[PDB]
Structures are given as structure tokens and as C-alpha cells.
Amino acid sequence: MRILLTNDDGIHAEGLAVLERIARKLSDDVWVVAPETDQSGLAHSLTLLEPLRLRQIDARHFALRGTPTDCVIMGVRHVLPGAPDLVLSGVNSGANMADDVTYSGTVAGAMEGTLLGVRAIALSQEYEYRRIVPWETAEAHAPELIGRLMEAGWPEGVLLNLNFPNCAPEEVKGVRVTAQGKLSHDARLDERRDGRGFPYFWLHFGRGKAPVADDSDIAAIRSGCISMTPLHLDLTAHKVRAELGAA
Amino acid sequence: MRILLTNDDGIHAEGLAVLERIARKLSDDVWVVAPETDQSGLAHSLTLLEPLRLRQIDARHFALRGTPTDCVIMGVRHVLPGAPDLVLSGVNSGANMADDVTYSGTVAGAMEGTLLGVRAIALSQEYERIVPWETAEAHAPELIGRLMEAGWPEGVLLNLNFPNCAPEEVKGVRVTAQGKLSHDARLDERRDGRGFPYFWLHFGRGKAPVADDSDIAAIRSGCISMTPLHLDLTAHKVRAELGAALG
Amino acid sequence: MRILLTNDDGIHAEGLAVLERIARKLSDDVWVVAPETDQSGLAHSLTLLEPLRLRQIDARHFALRGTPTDCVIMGVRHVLPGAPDLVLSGVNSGANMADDVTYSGTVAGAMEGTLLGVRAIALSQEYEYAGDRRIVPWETAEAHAPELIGRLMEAGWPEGVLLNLNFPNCAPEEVKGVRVTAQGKLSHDARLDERRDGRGFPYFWLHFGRGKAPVADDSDIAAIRSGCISMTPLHLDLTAHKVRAELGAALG
Amino acid sequence: MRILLTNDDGIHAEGLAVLERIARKLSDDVWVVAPETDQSGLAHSLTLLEPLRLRQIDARHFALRGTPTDCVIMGVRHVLPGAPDLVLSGVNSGANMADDVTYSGTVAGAMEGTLLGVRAIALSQEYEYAGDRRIVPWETAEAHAPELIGRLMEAGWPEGVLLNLNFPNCAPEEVKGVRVTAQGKLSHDARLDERRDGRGFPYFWLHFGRGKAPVADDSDIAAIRSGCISMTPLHLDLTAHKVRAELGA
Ligand SMILES: [Mg+2]
Ligand SMILES: [Mg+2]
Ligand SMILES: [Mg+2]
Ligand SMILES: [Mg+2]
């Protein structure tokens, strides 16, 4: 019933307005703590070296000069009158799938909710080009999905990662419980000079359309299905522990 | 044989000098690409929104105004004459165990090595700061040698923690699971020199029960801990509870 | 007739909305390039080491992640179709008087206009606290600025000089008049407050003890304390010309 | 006798090692508070919105994550055991003349010293490029600055005025002399170079050149172009006094 919202696109981004409309279908007790600005690539980082600055827009909406992870902690530990029952992060402008999950500020917001002991869901909306994001699709489908998930709980320590395909609402083919996909890791550095002549680089990622696993988040979205992947924060490769020849 | 080093403590930090002495026990072909400044809590974030600035100290040592993840990408894709055979990240001033792994720049350095297709190890030294660097320094070379000698699986990185003991006092080594600690985030509220509010975020140690197979338990016992980690975050066991759809 | 606006309070600050209303009393050809956020203390600094990021709000309003000086240069050299005839900077939330001038982003916005060859005016509005909130009587700058600027533009003033305008904290109909003032001099009371962060590491806040000491009767400060609008002509030649001849053996 | 040094080039920059050598010709009581990194274009800005972080290198050398202005305040009010008698700011890598003075971190260091009630001098060294390596003839400032500052300190100068010193790009023994100059007026040569980042998003670099135009024969610029050291007394009253009477009206 007490729902806390954050995102990585910023307090003023349309995706967050969309999330709050989704949230209000589930409860009236909604709280928003979101970054001041875009947080692309910020992953699960938080702000320890500099002060956090909190800006109140109204008694339920706050912007924070910090990461999504900072936002969730601020919400849970300072802003709300008690722990939220659900944390929602998004709706991101652009999908978060496969190896994105490690780098995603939207996914990290949910993670943080989960580390704080709260049920948490990340939501991301695939689009096409500039951006025409079919927000109505997440908006039409997210409420009932979250309602069902909340009704059937899910395990402690696991968060849900939802991606909505670039389709019109009535065109989405269905929903699938997926696994995290894998794409080729295509990091690229572009070297330039700044006009006082000093070198610098831009980092970006080539995002190829290669084959992925048929049960992946990617494959689902390519098929026009909503993807729901349960994710956890234990990174141990348990199957590997036994070797250990010789410890 | 080609070894790339990075850390989160910065190019000038003693932990990185320690790592390079360790690395030189394994090969003379060592390359260093490390942040300009000491930077906690950066996790697996990278720098997309601003330029990266690379600074050459000598032919094998480079500082980068960016994250450990940026450092590994720069090293692999731009600075080295070909892919390294091994990426080492650390030796961090402070342990990285249990829920730290999600937030650790030191660990993310290794994660990035792995995502680039390279065997990778993160190394961290528990302290009280008085950091008993000599302990990691005494024990790391042989451990890494054995690990390299035995393969380990593709997609898995190793997370090594050394206890706060004198070198001759360490009790042994254990292949461990990632522990789970209680989330212990603290916000201190203040007012700046102009009266305006701000917050400091920091973390205490939390109060969880330690599993006897965890990284934490090993370190508490005076043992070196080695946890194999992987980058598939799917909670596979949970997928089947999909009511009511496929996967 | 072509007017460019900027400020140091940010694209979304009320003082900039105020300045645009004033500007529209003087022309319909108004352009706005302003910082994304608050710029206190940024003086005449500009951004050389990092990229500038421009954001278009509409055809005449742009936010820039940079300083008020960066804004003017962006406006003059990139955004507008030709040089503005007038650069206005403000209306700042708080006065910019005396030793402030060297540090003020608002004043710098005008300085940059002037160095770019354009008539330029900085506007600032004095306020009072209740007791933490600022109550800024924007209506005062709003009521009085249009005619003052119109008269100044009509009479013209020398090239290389910018005007620095302060409005007192009075209701519009209470302002006692306007004075051409000199820059005042306040006691310089910079203070360092030492603290420890959440992890125990030291840091400092820099702040300034303000205080009501006596100033020169022809100063900007004195005028504002009297309830008068202050107009100080400023220039960008810092040479202490009177002191050059004073010599310990060399030409010039 | 107590001398505080700062710069805009940063605690590790050669120009600050040069300045300390110059300073030690004048006193053995020298204190250094300088920025952690390069501070081009920071003018007289200071740090109000974020914390200042101070780092001790030696008992006499400190780096501050902040502006030259912040450094001088820190040095005067906190680090030194009492006010310095002299603040020196530089030796900058590159001249600071004419309309540079308004933008210059090095000059602002000296400005702040003056506002804090201390005699202050900014020092800058003109250079040239060999391709892209700047070759800065530091030896020129080094050779000439100690005596000039000695004389200046021996003769007083007025309260509220700072001195801006520029050394020409000449070999030490080739400098033609010294001149008390006026601040020049250059052409403002700014432009904006538009690019796209790794993700396709626009950004600009702000390029500021020098003007390339004729200047007054008594300016800092004309002196330096002639191979002379330039010394310009500057003050912090920006009032255009000659214009006030005109303006009422
Ligand atoms: Mg986003
Ligand atoms: Mg560290
Ligand atoms: Mg302001
Ligand atoms: Mg410099």
C-alpha cells in the first residue's frame, strides 16, 4: 500500500509520470524520490564522497542530486514515515535487458529496495526513433501484472525486472517469465581533441542484433511479449565452488 | 602473461603498488590503468555523460579520470597492444564481502574484465587506518598462480579477501559463498555554511547472522576467502513459480 | 531591439521570469539562455575543461549547463541570428553590491555582454527573510526597471561600461528614488567552518559573515539602505591608473 | 616575511615549483596552498555549494580541491598560523593580460589576497608551442622576478591594489626591460565547436583564442610583444567614476 518510486531518467522525465499513473492504479499512498538529472550508466553506484541535496517539490515528490540507489535509501530511511511495501523503479526510456542489468540505474533502484528488505520491481519500455516511446503500453499492462505479482508474493531477496516491447498496447502478444539474456560486449572508445588541443575519449557501446537464447528477456521482447525476469543479488557461482582442488 | 591492473583507490594508492608487486611475481608484462582519485561506492558504473581523460605516467602506467570499469575498458580496448590474459583489480583498502559486492568498484573492475572475455580477480585487504598489506602481498601470488594453473569457468570472476591478520597468522584459505549482511545505511542530516540542508550517506556493518560457508565467516576466522562470482543475476529457481504463464 | 537574457539563479528561477516580463515591455524580440541550476559565487568563470550541454525549451528559451558567462557567449555566438542590442542579467534573488561584484555571476553575465561589444545591465533585487524563506519583492524591480532601462537606452552610455542595478527591499510605490552610485566597500568576513563527514573525514564550508558596518554615503549600499534604487556604472579596466606614475625606477 | 603561494595550474605544476624558488629568494617562511588540479577560466569564483577538501602534503604544502580564491582564503584564515605578509599567485603557464584579467584564476588569487588585506602579486609567464608541447621559459620569470618583487616590497604600494606581472617569451638575458603598463584591450575570440558524444548527443567545446589586433602602445600586451616585463597595478573598484556625472540626467 505504501509505494515508493524512483527512476534513472530524472524527476522531470515522462517515464516517471507514467510510473506514477501506474502506481496510483494500485494505491493512493505514493511517494516519489528521483534524481535531479539523467543517470545513464550509473549502475548500483551511490554518493559517499559528496553531500546529498534533497529538494522538495511537494509533500510526496522529491528530487535528489544523487543516484537511483541514493534515492531509494533516502526514501526509505529519511523521507517516508515508515518503510514502503513496494518499491518501483522506472519506467525507463529504453529497455534494460541482458548485460544491461549490471549497468542499469533503473534496475539498481529495485535492487536497493530489495537490499532494504522491500518488494521491488524495475520497469523499462522499449521504443523506436527522435524517441517515440509507447508509454501507453507499459501504462496499460503494468498495473495488472504488478497486482498479480503482489498477490502471489515472490521470494525474499528477489526483484522483478519488467521490460515492455515496442508495440501498441493491444498488440502485445503476451508475457513470459524469462531469463537474463546475453549479448556481445561491444564497448568502444572514440578519441578526440578538445580545442585547447587536449585529448579525450567518449565511451559508447555498439548494440548488435545477434542471436540470443529463446528463453531470454531479449527474445521475448523481440517477439512482442512482455518480459519478466526474477533477479537476485547473490552473485555466487555455486556450481563452481566444489573445484577447489586444492582448498 | 599480459596482466592489466586497476583499482578503486586511485593510481597513487598503496594498495595498487602492492598489487603491482604481487603481479610482478607472476609476469614482467604488467600494465596499469587506474582512477585519478580514490572513489568508493561506484559499483559497476561507467562514464557516458562526460569525456574520459587519460594521463600517461610512463609507458606502462596510466591514470584515468573515471571508474574502475572505465579503466578496464580503456586498458583492454585502447591502451594495451592486445588483450590482457589476466585482469587484477585492487588491492583494495578494506574488505569487499557479502552485500558489498554489488557496490564495490574493486569487484566491478573484475566484472568488467570478465565481460570483456578475460580472466579476472578482485583483491581486497581487511584492515582496522592500518592496513596489513603484507598479508595480501605474502599470500596472493601463490593463490593466483594456482588459480591460473587450474582453469576456472568462463563467465566467472574470483573475489579474494584477505583477513586483518599478520601474514604468518592467516589460518588458511576457503572457497566461500557470498554472505548476506543486514543493510546498514545511515543518513546524517546537516546545514551548510549558508543554512541549507544536506545529508551524508554512510554505512555501518549491519547485524545479520553469518552463514558458516560465507566470505564473512571465513575472514572472521582468520582465513583468506575466495568466492567465485558470475554475472547472470537470474533467480532461476524462482522462474517456475510463474502463475499464470510460460517459463 | 534584440534582447538576450541570462541569470545566475537558473532557467527556472522566478527572477528570470520577472526579467523576461520587464524585457517584453521594451521589445518583443527576446531570447533566453540561462544556467540549468544555481550558480552562486561563480563570478566571471567559464567552462573550458568540460563540454557545454545546451537544452532547448522552445524557440527562444534555452538552458545551458554552464555559467552565466558561458550563457552569454552561447547566446551571442551560437544561438541568436545576430548580435543582441542589449544583454540583461538577472533579476537576481538578492542584491549584488560592493565587494559582491567581483564574485557575482549575475554581474558577470553583464560583463560578458560588455566584452562582446554589447550594452549590458545587471539587475538584482534586495529581499528580507521570514525567517528562513526569502520574501523577494519582485514587483519592485518589475515596476521600476522598464522605464529606467528605457531612459538609459535613450540617453546611451559609454562603450566598455555596463550598468549594475539594485532595487531595494521596499514596496514599489515606497521606493524613494534612484541614485547614480559608486561601488561600495564592505568588511571582508570570509569564514571556514570545519566538519567531519559521515565517514569521519574532514571538510570545510566556506561562508561569509555579513554585517551592517558603515559604508560611503555615495555607495550602492547606502542608496539601497535609504530605499533608493542604485545604478552603478562599472567597467572592465582594472588598472589603477593614478598609481602608475608612482615609481621606484622604471618607465611608463 | 610570511609568504603564501597559490596558483591556477595546480599543486603539481612546474610554475608553482618555480614560484616557490622565487619566493625562497625573499624569505624562508613560505607556505603553499594550491588547487588539486588545473583551474583554467575560473576567474574569481569560489566554492559555496560543495565542501572543500584539504590535503596536507608537507608541513608547508597543501592541496585544496577548490579554486585559487578558495586556496587564498584557506591559507589566510585557517592553514597559516597568522596572516601572511605577502600573497604570490602563479607562475602561470601562459600570460594573463588585457581582457584575460577578468577570467584569470591566477589574477584572482592575488585579488583575494588584496581583499583579505594582504599585499599581493600575480605572476604569469608567456610561452610558445613546439607543435603541441608548450615550452615555457620559466627561467625568465625565475631570473627576473626575485629582484622586482624585492624592490616592490621595499618601496610600499597602495592598499587595495595588486600587481599583475607578465614575463615575455624570451631567454632571460634577452628581456629588454620592465615597464609599468596599463591593462590592454584585445579582440574577444570565442567560439563554440559543436560535436556529438558516444551516444549521439550534442555538446559544445568553448574555444577562446587571443584577438590578433592592434593594441595601445602603453599596454601590457605591447610591452610583452616588445620583449619587456609588464607590471600593471590593478584594483578592485570597478566603478567607472568618470561616467557617473553624465549619467544623471
Ligand atoms: Mg534511463
Ligand atoms: Mg577502495
Ligand atoms: Mg543568484
Ligand atoms: Mg594556468
Strands D61-65 vs D86-93: parallel, antiparallel or unpaired: unpaired
Chains contacting D (3+ CB pairs below 8 angstroms):
A, B, C
Which chains reach chain B with 3 or more Cβ–Cβ distances below 8 angstroms? A, C, D
Residue B135, Cβ neighbours under 10 Å: how many?
24
Q: Alpha helix locations (H) across chain B?
A: 14-26, 68-74, 100-103, 105-115, 133-149, 215-220
What DSSP state is assigned to residue D109?
H
The region, left, alpha or beta by phi > 0 then psi within -120 to 50, assigned to residue C114 is alpha
**Please, are residues D247 and C233 in contact by the beta-carbon 8 Å criterion?**
yes
The answer to whether the Cα torsion of D102, D107, D109, D110 is positive or negative is negative
The closest alpha carbon to A88, from A178, A7, A176, A180, belongs to A7
Instruction: Residue D57: give its domain's CATH number.
Output: 3.40.1210.10
Specify the DSSP class assigned to residue B185: E
Resolution of this structure in Å: 1.9
Broken C–N links (> 2.5 Å) in chain C, after residues:
none
Q: Which residues of D touch B49 (CB under 8 A)?
A: 197
CB contact under 8 Å between C54 and D202, yes or no, is: yes
DSSP E strand boundaries for chain B = 3-6, 30-35, 54-58, 61-64, 86-93, 119-125, 156-162, 172-175, 185-191, 197-203, 223-230
Separation of CA D55 from chain center: 22
Rounded to whole angstroms, the Cα distance separating C230 from C164 reads 8
Residue A136 host element (H or E): helix A135-151
User: Rounded to an integer, what distance in angstroms lies between the CA atom of residue C185 and that of residue D236?
Assistant: 10
Cα–Cα distance for residue pair B77/C67, rounded to 1 Å = 35
The full DSSP string for chain C is -EEEEE-SS-TT-HHHHHHHHHHHHH-SEEEEEEESS--TT-TT----SS-B-EEEEETTEEEESS-HHHHHHHIIIIISSS--SEEEEEEEEB---GGGGGT-HHHHHHHHHHHTT-EEEEEEE--EEETTEEE--HHHHHHHHHHHHHHHHHH---TTEEEEEEE-SS-GGG--EEEE-B-------EEEEEEE-TTS-EEEEEEE--------TTBHHHHHHTTEEEEEEEES--B-HHHHS--SS-B-
Distances D48 to B69, B212, C12, C73, D51 between C-alpha atoms, Å: 31, 49, 20, 24, 8
DSSP reduced 3-state for A54: strand
The C-alpha cell at B191 is 546545514
Distance CA D186, CA D214 (A): 8
* C58 DSSP β-pair partners: C61
Question: Residue A243, class by beta-carbon neighbours within 10 Å (0-12 exposed, 13-18 middle, 19+ buried)?
Answer: middle
- What span, in angstroms and rounded, lies between the C-alpha atoms of C125 and D204? 33
Q: Quick one: which of C95, C68, C86 has its CA closest to C232? A: C95
Q: Report the number of distinct structural domains present in chain A.
A: 1
Q: Is B40 annotated as a binding residue?
A: yes
Q: Beta partners for D92? A: D124
- Per the listing, cell 561563480 goes with C42
CA distance C193 to D48: 12
Q: Which ligand is nearest to the CA of B7?
A: 2
Ligand that comes closest to the CA of residue B93: 2
3-class SS of residue A93: strand
Question: Which residues have CB atoms below 5 A from the ion given as ligand 2?
Answer: B 8-9, 92
Residue B212 backbone class (left: φ over 0; alpha: ψ -120 to 50; beta: rest)? alpha
Mode of pairing for the β-strands spanning D128-130 and D133-135: antiparallel
Task: Give the sheet arrangement for strand D30-35, strand by strand.
Answer: D53-56, D61-65, D30-35, D3-6, D86-93, D119-125, D161-167, D228-235, D177-180
Pick the closest to residue C90 from C127, C124, C46, C61 (CA basis).
C124
Which of D157, D155, D77 is CA-nearest to residue D119?
A: D157
Nearest by CB to residue C237, choosing from D183, D203, D244, is D183
Query: Per residue in A25-60, is it b (16+ CB within 10 Å) or e — as a string?
Result: ebeebbbbbbbbbbbbbbbbbbbbbbbbbbeeeeee
The answer to whether the Cβ–Cβ distance between A38 and B44 falls below 8 Å is no
C-alpha cell belonging to residue C222: 547606502
Range of the domain at A103: 1-247
Output the CA A200–ligand 1 centroid distance in Å: 24
- The answer to whether D19 touches D88, Cβ cutoff 8 Å, is yes
Residue B169 DSSP symbol: G
For residues B180 and B52, give the distance between their C-alpha atoms in angstroms, rounded to a whole number.
Answer: 35
d(CA C122, CA C109): 7
Residues of chain B with a CB closer than 8 angstroms to some CB in chain C: 50-51, 186, 188, 190, 192-195, 200-202
